[PDB]
Design a protein around this motif. Structure first.
Motif, PDB file in Angstrom:
ATOM      1  N   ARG C  72       0.838  -1.197   0.000  1.00 49.53           N
ATOM      2  CA  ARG C  72       0.000   0.000   0.000  1.00 49.53           C
ATOM      3  C   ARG C  72       0.869   1.242   0.000  1.00 49.53           C
ATOM      4  O   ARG C  72       0.452   2.286  -0.485  1.00 49.53           O
ATOM      5  N   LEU C  73       2.080   1.116   0.539  1.00 47.22           N
ATOM      6  CA  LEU C  73       3.076   2.182   0.487  1.00 47.22           C
ATOM      7  C   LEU C  73       3.420   2.509  -0.960  1.00 47.22           C
ATOM      8  O   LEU C  73       3.450   3.672  -1.374  1.00 47.22           O
ATOM      9  N   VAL C  74       3.687   1.451  -1.711  1.00 50.96           N
ATOM     10  CA  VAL C  74       4.006   1.529  -3.130  1.00 50.96           C
ATOM     11  C   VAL C  74       2.859   2.067  -3.989  1.00 50.96           C
ATOM     12  O   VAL C  74       3.065   2.900  -4.860  1.00 50.96           O
ATOM     13  N   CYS C  75       1.652   1.563  -3.768  1.00 53.67           N
ATOM     14  CA  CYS C  75       0.562   1.798  -4.709  1.00 53.67           C
ATOM     15  C   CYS C  75      -0.008   3.197  -4.518  1.00 53.67           C
ATOM     16  O   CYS C  75      -0.318   3.900  -5.487  1.00 53.67           O
ATOM     17  N   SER C  76      -0.122   3.597  -3.255  1.00 49.05           N
ATOM     18  CA  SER C  76      -0.547   4.943  -2.911  1.00 49.05           C
ATOM     19  C   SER C  76       0.291   6.012  -3.606  1.00 49.05           C
ATOM     20  O   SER C  76      -0.261   6.955  -4.157  1.00 49.05           O
ATOM     21  N   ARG C  77       1.614   5.862  -3.595  1.00 51.51           N
ATOM     22  CA  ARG C  77       2.486   6.809  -4.303  1.00 51.51           C
ATOM     23  C   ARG C  77       2.193   6.809  -5.791  1.00 51.51           C
ATOM     24  O   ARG C  77       2.038   7.870  -6.387  1.00 51.51           O
ATOM     25  N   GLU C  78       2.110   5.623  -6.382  1.00 45.60           N
ATOM     26  CA  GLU C  78       1.864   5.508  -7.819  1.00 45.60           C
ATOM     27  C   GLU C  78       0.521   6.112  -8.195  1.00 45.60           C
ATOM     28  O   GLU C  78       0.414   6.840  -9.184  1.00 45.60           O
ATOM     29  N   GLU C 101      -5.731  16.974  -0.249  1.00 45.63           N
ATOM     30  CA  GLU C 101      -5.083  17.169   1.046  1.00 45.63           C
ATOM     31  C   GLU C 101      -5.096  15.855   1.826  1.00 45.63           C
ATOM     32  O   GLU C 101      -4.040  15.368   2.232  1.00 45.63           O
ATOM     33  N   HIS C 102      -6.285  15.278   2.011  1.00 47.46           N
ATOM     34  CA  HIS C 102      -6.429  14.058   2.807  1.00 47.46           C
ATOM     35  C   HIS C 102      -5.397  12.996   2.404  1.00 47.46           C
ATOM     36  O   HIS C 102      -4.780  12.349   3.263  1.00 47.46           O
ATOM     37  N   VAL C 103      -5.215  12.829   1.094  1.00 49.36           N
ATOM     38  CA  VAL C 103      -4.288  11.827   0.565  1.00 49.36           C
ATOM     39  C   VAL C 103      -2.840  12.274   0.769  1.00 49.36           C
ATOM     40  O   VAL C 103      -2.099  11.636   1.530  1.00 49.36           O
ATOM     41  N   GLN C 104      -2.454  13.366   0.101  1.00 44.59           N
ATOM     42  CA  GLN C 104      -1.111  13.963   0.229  1.00 44.59           C
ATOM     43  C   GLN C 104      -0.604  13.956   1.687  1.00 44.59           C
ATOM     44  O   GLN C 104       0.478  13.428   1.979  1.00 44.59           O
ATOM     45  N   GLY C 105      -1.412  14.524   2.582  1.00 45.68           N
ATOM     46  CA  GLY C 105      -1.085  14.632   4.003  1.00 45.68           C
ATOM     47  C   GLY C 105      -0.782  13.300   4.650  1.00 45.68           C
ATOM     48  O   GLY C 105       0.084  13.217   5.521  1.00 45.68           O
ATOM     49  N   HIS C 106      -1.508  12.269   4.216  1.00 49.24           N
ATOM     50  CA  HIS C 106      -1.293  10.883   4.650  1.00 49.24           C
ATOM     51  C   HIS C 106      -0.015  10.270   4.065  1.00 49.24           C
ATOM     52  O   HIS C 106       0.693   9.527   4.746  1.00 49.24           O
ATOM     53  N   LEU C 107       0.270  10.573   2.803  1.00 49.08           N
ATOM     54  CA  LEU C 107       1.450  10.026   2.117  1.00 49.08           C
ATOM     55  C   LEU C 107       2.808  10.445   2.701  1.00 49.08           C
ATOM     56  O   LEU C 107       3.772   9.667   2.700  1.00 49.08           O
ATOM     57  N   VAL C 108       2.873  11.670   3.203  1.00 46.69           N
ATOM     58  CA  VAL C 108       4.104  12.199   3.793  1.00 46.69           C
ATOM     59  C   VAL C 108       4.253  11.685   5.235  1.00 46.69           C
ATOM     60  O   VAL C 108       5.371  11.406   5.691  1.00 46.69           O
ATOM     61  N   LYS C 109       3.122  11.550   5.933  1.00 49.79           N
ATOM     62  CA  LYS C 109       3.070  10.790   7.184  1.00 49.79           C
ATOM     63  C   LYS C 109       3.261   9.288   6.943  1.00 49.79           C
ATOM     64  O   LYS C 109       3.551   8.535   7.875  1.00 49.79           O
ATOM     65  N   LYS C 110       3.078   8.857   5.695  1.00 51.53           N
ATOM     66  CA  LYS C 110       3.267   7.467   5.303  1.00 51.53           C
ATOM     67  C   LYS C 110       2.290   6.571   6.062  1.00 51.53           C
ATOM     68  O   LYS C 110       2.651   5.492   6.535  1.00 51.53           O
ATOM     69  N   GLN C 111       1.048   7.044   6.174  1.00 49.39           N
ATOM     70  CA  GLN C 111      -0.037   6.266   6.770  1.00 49.39           C
ATOM     71  C   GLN C 111      -0.962   5.846   5.631  1.00 49.39           C
ATOM     72  O   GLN C 111      -1.592   6.688   4.988  1.00 49.39           O
ATOM     73  N   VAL C 112      -1.011   4.536   5.387  1.00 49.94           N
ATOM     74  CA  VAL C 112      -1.632   3.970   4.190  1.00 49.94           C
ATOM     75  C   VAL C 112      -2.739   2.953   4.503  1.00 49.94           C
ATOM     76  O   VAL C 112      -2.638   1.770   4.147  1.00 49.94           O
ATOM     77  N   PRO C 113      -3.816   3.417   5.165  1.00 52.48           N
ATOM     78  CA  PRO C 113      -4.926   2.512   5.340  1.00 52.48           C
ATOM     79  C   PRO C 113      -5.586   2.252   3.966  1.00 52.48           C
ATOM     80  O   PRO C 113      -5.497   3.115   3.075  1.00 52.48           O
ATOM     81  N   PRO C 114      -6.211   1.060   3.781  1.00 54.78           N
ATOM     82  CA  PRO C 114      -6.969   0.706   2.559  1.00 54.78           C
ATOM     83  C   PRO C 114      -8.067   1.709   2.134  1.00 54.78           C
ATOM     84  O   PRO C 114      -8.298   1.924   0.934  1.00 54.78           O
ATOM     85  N   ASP C 115      -8.727   2.325   3.105  1.00 56.53           N
ATOM     86  CA  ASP C 115      -9.619   3.432   2.794  1.00 56.53           C
ATOM     87  C   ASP C 115      -8.864   4.749   2.589  1.00 56.53           C
ATOM     88  O   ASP C 115      -9.430   5.815   2.792  1.00 56.53           O
ATOM     89  N   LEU C 116      -7.596   4.694   2.177  1.00 54.67           N
ATOM     90  CA  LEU C 116      -6.846   5.926   1.958  1.00 54.67           C
ATOM     91  C   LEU C 116      -7.639   6.877   1.051  1.00 54.67           C
ATOM     92  O   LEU C 116      -7.870   8.051   1.414  1.00 54.67           O
ATOM     93  N   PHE C 117      -8.074   6.365  -0.104  1.00 52.42           N
ATOM     94  CA  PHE C 117      -8.678   7.205  -1.128  1.00 52.42           C
ATOM     95  C   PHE C 117     -10.203   7.203  -1.087  1.00 52.42           C
ATOM     96  O   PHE C 117     -10.854   7.516  -2.101  1.00 52.42           O
ATOM     97  N   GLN C 118     -10.785   6.863   0.064  1.00 50.77           N
ATOM     98  CA  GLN C 118     -12.244   6.814   0.171  1.00 50.77           C
ATOM     99  C   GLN C 118     -12.851   8.160  -0.179  1.00 50.77           C
ATOM    100  O   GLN C 118     -13.915   8.198  -0.776  1.00 50.77           O
ATOM    101  N   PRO C 119     -12.179   9.270   0.191  1.00 45.48           N
ATOM    102  CA  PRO C 119     -12.706  10.576  -0.234  1.00 45.48           C
ATOM    103  C   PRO C 119     -12.738  10.805  -1.758  1.00 45.48           C
ATOM    104  O   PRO C 119     -13.609  11.539  -2.246  1.00 45.48           O
ATOM    105  N   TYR C 120     -11.825  10.181  -2.506  1.00 41.78           N
ATOM    106  CA  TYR C 120     -11.863  10.279  -3.972  1.00 41.78           C
ATOM    107  C   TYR C 120     -12.978   9.422  -4.547  1.00 41.78           C
ATOM    108  O   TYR C 120     -13.625   9.818  -5.519  1.00 41.78           O
TER     109      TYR C 120
END
Ligand SMILES: CC1=C(C(=O)Nc2ccc3[nH]ncc3c2)[C@H](c2ccc(F)c(C(=O)NCCc3c(C)cccc3C)c2)NC(=O)N1
Ligand SMILES: [Mg+2]
Lengths: 58, 339, 623
Positions: C72-78, C101-120
């Motif tokens: 999820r670390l890998v895929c979120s960045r991609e 913001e929700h995504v970007q902010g999470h990516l730099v914190k490197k917090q990658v829950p499966p619902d990462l992109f639920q807002p999208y």
């Protein structure tokens, strides 16, 4: 009905209808009879025509 | 009160008109025409039958060439027929199924029709493309189109259930003149031969004479006990005839401003859908809701003939400009041509 | 044999049938597997604007399913780089600042829950509902939807629709068979219940109820319940089409293998729990939990089956003593006393105890006395053997709490409570759910009763298709090949229209209300059905056979009534005509019948209303 303007309009209309020149029915009649007589020659339904000049027989 | 006065004054003027008229009732048409020979046997026969419409026929009009005609049908189409051949020149799928009326233009370049869509659609027949397209959709009526007749290829008169009639400029699509006066649905109109006048018959049981070029009603004829469903000019333009749901036709004279002749018989109870004169006006043909067209003697009032070749209502009819023939159209889906 | 779509003409009726039911919304199409499937094929291939969007939805979909955090670390960045960053750099990224913001902010914190992109997700949807959707609607892909949906809404099943094979279970009311649905070849179980054998033991409720229960539980594709895709009946039998479990039940495997190690039991419970969770979330209690209702699939994984005695409580609460003796809670056995989820958890313990010990915990010295077990359960916490571990001991205690107010999985988080027992300390619950744990046991390889109108009326609403289950079934079997085959047939007939030149469409440019095939009686004398293409207009119904234009019709004025009638046990429309005459119409599918009936009805009413205000059109008196 209760519109003042429509009642006015109605009245002006009847005035226009009232003050026309009328002819006696006797003459108006005669004039129709006259027309009818003067044109009964030219009336295919008034005289059965020869089929020759009748576009609907052959 | 001014309203109360205007009511009285209209009432006086109605009476003044009634007396003015009786002052011309020196003789009757019946009296005047007691001399002339009867008309004898008017036995006409179905020459053509026009088969094609899938449903009732509401109206028809002959081309001025006394050969073509348009008819409008419940099947939602116009058929322009060549009556000599019975060939459909054109079949026109209308945009609204609720067509009631239709008209052939004098030139024969256009037809018109309309109905419950409250629109007088002008169809054009000859393009350079060779196609039948809707050239104008004349809108403005707030009720069904009941009748329409082209003055030429650019002015056309209509009638409508909105109680009004109207004159249009086709090119522009404008309602250039509005004819008001009727108090019930206007059902039919007829143009004078000069076309500077037309008459309209209505559900108010009155018929009215209008000046095309001035926009007003000159004369109002009453006497029918019910809807005037159809109206036709006497061919010289000083009289017209009406047909009504009261089962009579009548001839009204313009210059005498009144009824001369009721055409009726106790046998006939059904109403009249359509009227038309023979070319000399001597014959008055009427379509009836008993399925027949009766041929009347305009001058004597004798019933003189019966067209009996329809199974439902005769809904419309017409005599050719050339005098030769008579179309009848009917609720049974057919037009029959007669002479 | 196999599924045959209607021609694209069917669109006329279905669009209306669905519109009338409110089903042509993005929400309602997009959430149907076949809906989705078509909606995308449309976006991805036939619109430059929506390709990226769906592509983005899909990638987030794939992302949600990734198991490792290191993945999820890998895929979120991609995903961020392709669907977010890049589109930002060309201002063609139409989403709320909030989502980015929700995504970007999470990516730099490197917090990658499966619902990462639920807002999208919510917002990609926002873009797609609307103009994108209305264009979909306009497209041939929505036609395809209508075609498929037409099939769906006209499913009628018969044993004949299935290829029955071996018997895999018997009971009181009938037998269970393995079978394959001809259509698509999908393997299923068919549980048949003989209605006579039912009326006999007066189990008309158990059947009727198992159906309603199945219908509550069977959405969601729960891998731990034997859910139902269909139910139909014959005058003799009831049919449930269910998930196919060919490994038999635990009650049998307990016999064959003997009592289970704790570790082996951990497996079964894990999966059973997820089943319970599933039901409990739909306010259904199984009530009858025991080894014999735990079936094993081919691989050893289990499912809860046979919701006979299950029970809804989304409103009213059960109280009756129902369940098998040895597994019923106290508040179950205690008549009067209401209850919910609670009992299953109790039974759960009873059940797990049984898998460890060979007999129910309230069944010492192999007593066979119902009354003996009942009362012990009511008041006697259980002897938990020397051999049991503390983690287990704790879990059973928790479950077999006679006090429901302090019962493991009864304290307002249900299942979750139990997943947290130290007993399951060592399990990843996604892995349980993905069925990734190795299962311990791999399975080896007369009456005079009659059937009245009043009986058959009881099973009137028994028939049923589960849309999800059928669409899934279709999606994975024949949906793709059927789509090509049909695509090919349609675009062929586009050519044999264009050569022959009938290339004008008779229904366009007028006021046609609706069209499509139906059949009528041709010959009064002969009484067979000719299938014709009808076109309803405001004032007439026209029809035509091939080539020719319509040369016949009814007028809406002629039509006096529209009604259903049976003809040769087929539902048909019966139009009564003015003369005393009649007219009869058969439709190709239930929705076509519902619509033609509604629309004919509507149009004749309209027409006569309208005609009545038109002096030239109306009827006048005659004598
Ligand atoms: C789970 C189960 C049975 C069963 O095998 N059901 C089943 C369901 C879905 C499936 N998918 N793939 C396989 C599969 C199997 C099987 C079974 C099969 C058919 C049935 F009708 C029943 C049943 O209803 N038994 C009622 C018990 C009974 C009562 C209450 C009264 C009198 C006599 C009896 C036998 C039970 N036996 C059983 O104990 N439970
Ligand atoms: Mg209880």
């Amino acid at each position: 009905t209760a519109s003042i303007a429509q009642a006015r309009k109605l009245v002006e209309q009847l005035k226009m209808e009232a003050n026309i020149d009328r002819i006696k029915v006797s003459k108006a009649a005669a004039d129709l009879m006259a027309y009818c007589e003067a044109h009964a020659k030219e009336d295919p339904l008034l005289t059965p025509v020869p089929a020759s000049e009748n576009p609907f027989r052959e | 009160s001014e309203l109360d006065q205007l009511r009285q004054e209209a009432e006086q003027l109605k009476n003044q008109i009634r007396d003015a008229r009786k002052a011309c009732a020196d003789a009757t048409l019946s009296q005047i025409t007691n001399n002339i020979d009867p008309v004898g046997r008017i036995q006409m026969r179905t020459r053509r039958t026009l088969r094609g419409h899938l449903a009732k026929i509401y109206a028809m009009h002959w081309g001025t060439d006394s050969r073509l005609l348009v008819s409008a049908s419940q099947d939602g189409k116009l058929i322009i027929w060549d009556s000599y051949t019975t060939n459909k020149v054109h079949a026109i799928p209308l945009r609204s199924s609720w067509v009631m009326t239709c008209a052939y233009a004098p030139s024969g370049n256009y037809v018109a029709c309309g109905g419950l869509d409250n629109i007088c659609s002008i169809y054009n027949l000859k393009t350079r493309e060779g196609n039948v397209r809707v050239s104008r959709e004349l809108a403005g009526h707030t009720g069904y189109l009941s009748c329409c007749r082209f003055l030429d290829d650019n002015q056309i008169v209509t009638s409508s259930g909105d109680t009004t009639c109207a004159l249009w400029d086709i090119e522009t699509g404008q309602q250039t003149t509005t004819f008001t006066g009727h108090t019930g649905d206007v059902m039919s109109l007829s143009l004078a031969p000069d076309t500077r006048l037309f008459v309209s018959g209505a559900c108010d049981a009155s018929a009215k004479l209008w000046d095309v070029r001035e926009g007003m009603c000159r004369q109002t004829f009453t006497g029918h006990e019910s809807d005037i469903n159809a109206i036709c000019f006497f061919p010289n333009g000083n009289a017209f005839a009406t047909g009504s749901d009261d089962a009579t036709c009548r001839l009204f004279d313009l210059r005498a401003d009144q009824e001369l002749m009721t055409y009726s018989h106790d046998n006939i109870i059904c109403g009249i859908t359509s009227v038309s004169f023979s070319k000399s006006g001597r014959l008055l043909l009427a379509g009836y809701d008993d399925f027949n067209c009766n041929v009347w003697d305009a001058l004597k009032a004798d019933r003189a003939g019966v067209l009996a070749g329809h199974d439902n209502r005769v809904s419309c009819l017409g005599v050719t400009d050339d005098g030769m023939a008579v179309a009848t159209g009917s609720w049974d889906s057919f037009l029959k041509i007669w002479n | 044999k196999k599924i045959l779509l209607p021609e694209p003409s069917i669109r006329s009726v279905m669009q209306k049938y669905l519109e009338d039911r409110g089903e042509v919304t993005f929400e309602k199409i997009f959430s149907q597997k076949l809906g989705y499937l078509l909606f995308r094929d449309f976006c991805l291939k036939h619109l430059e604007e929506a390709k990226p969007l769906v592509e983005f939805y899909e990638e987030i979909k794939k992302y949600e399913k990734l198991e490792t955090e290191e993945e999820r670390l890998v895929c979120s960045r991609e995903i961020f780089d392709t669907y977010i960053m890049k589109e930002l750099l060309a201002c063609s990224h139409p989403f709320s600042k909030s989502a980015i913001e929700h995504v970007q902010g999470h990516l730099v914190k490197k917090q990658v829950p499966p619902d990462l992109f639920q807002p999208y997700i919510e917002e990609i949807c926002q873009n797609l509902r609307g103009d994108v959707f209305q264009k979909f609607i306009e497209s041939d892909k929505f036609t395809r939807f209508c075609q498929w949906k037409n099939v769906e809404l006209n499913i009628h099943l018969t044993m004949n629709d299935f290829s029955v094979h071996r018997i895999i279970g018997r009971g009181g009311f009938g037998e269970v068979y393995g079978c394959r649905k001809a259509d698509t070849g999908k393997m299923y179980a068919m549980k048949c219940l003989d209605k006579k054998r039912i009326k006999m033991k007066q189990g008309e409720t158990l059947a009727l109820n198992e159906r309603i229960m199945l219908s509550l539980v069977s959405t969601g594709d729960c891998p731990f319940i034997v859910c139902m895709s269909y139910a139909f009946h014959t005058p003799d039998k009831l049919s449930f089409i269910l998930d196919l479990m060919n490994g038999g039940d635990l009650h049998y495997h307990l016999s064959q293998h003997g009592v289970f190690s704790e570790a082996d039991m951990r497996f079964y419970a894990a999966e059973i729990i997820l089943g319970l969770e599933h039901m409990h979330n739909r306010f259904v209690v199984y009530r009858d939990l025991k080894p014999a209702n735990i079936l094993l699939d081919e691989h050893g994984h289990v499912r809860i089956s046979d919701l006979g005695l299950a029970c809804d409580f989304s409103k009213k609460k059960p109280h009756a003593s129902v369940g098998t003796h040895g597994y019923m809670a106290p508040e179950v056995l205690q008549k009067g006393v209401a209850y919910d989820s609670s009992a299953d958890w109790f039974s759960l313990g009873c059940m797990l105890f049984k898998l460890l010990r060979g007999h129910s915990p309230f069944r010492q010295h192999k007593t066979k006395d119902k009354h003996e077990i009942d009362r012990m359960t009511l008041t006697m916490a259980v002897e938990l053997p020397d051999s049991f571990s503390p983690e287990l001991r704790s879990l059973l205690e928790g479950l077999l709490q006679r006090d429901v107010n302090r019962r493991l999985g009864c304290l307002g988080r249900g299942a979750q409570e139990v997943k947290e027992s130290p007993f399951f300390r060592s399990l990843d619950w996604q892995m349980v759910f993905l069925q990734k744990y190795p299962p311990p046991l791999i399975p080896p390889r007369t009456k005079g009763i009659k059937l009245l109108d009043s009986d058959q009326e009881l099973y009137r609403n028994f028939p049923l298709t589960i849309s999800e289950r059928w669409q899934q079934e279709v999606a994975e079997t024949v949906f793709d090949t059927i789509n090509a085959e049909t695509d090919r047939l349609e675009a062929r007939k586009k050519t044999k229209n264009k050569q022959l030149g009938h290339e004008e469409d008779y229904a366009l440019g007028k006021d046609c209300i609706m069209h499509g095939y139906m059949s009528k009686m041709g010959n009064p004398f002969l009484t067979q059905w000719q299938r014709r293409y009808f076109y309803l207009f405001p004032n007439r119904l026209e029809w035509r056979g091939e080539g020719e234009a319509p040369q016949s019709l009814l007028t809406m004025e002629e039509i006096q009534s529209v009604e259903e009638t049976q003809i040769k046990e087929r539902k048909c429309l019966l139009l009564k005509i003015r003369g005393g005459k009649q007219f009869v119409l058969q439709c190709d599918s239930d929705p076509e019948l519902v619509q033609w009936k509604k629309e004919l009805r509507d149009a004749y009413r309209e027409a006569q209303q309208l005609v009545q205000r038109v002096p030239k059109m109306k009827n006048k008196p005659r004598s």
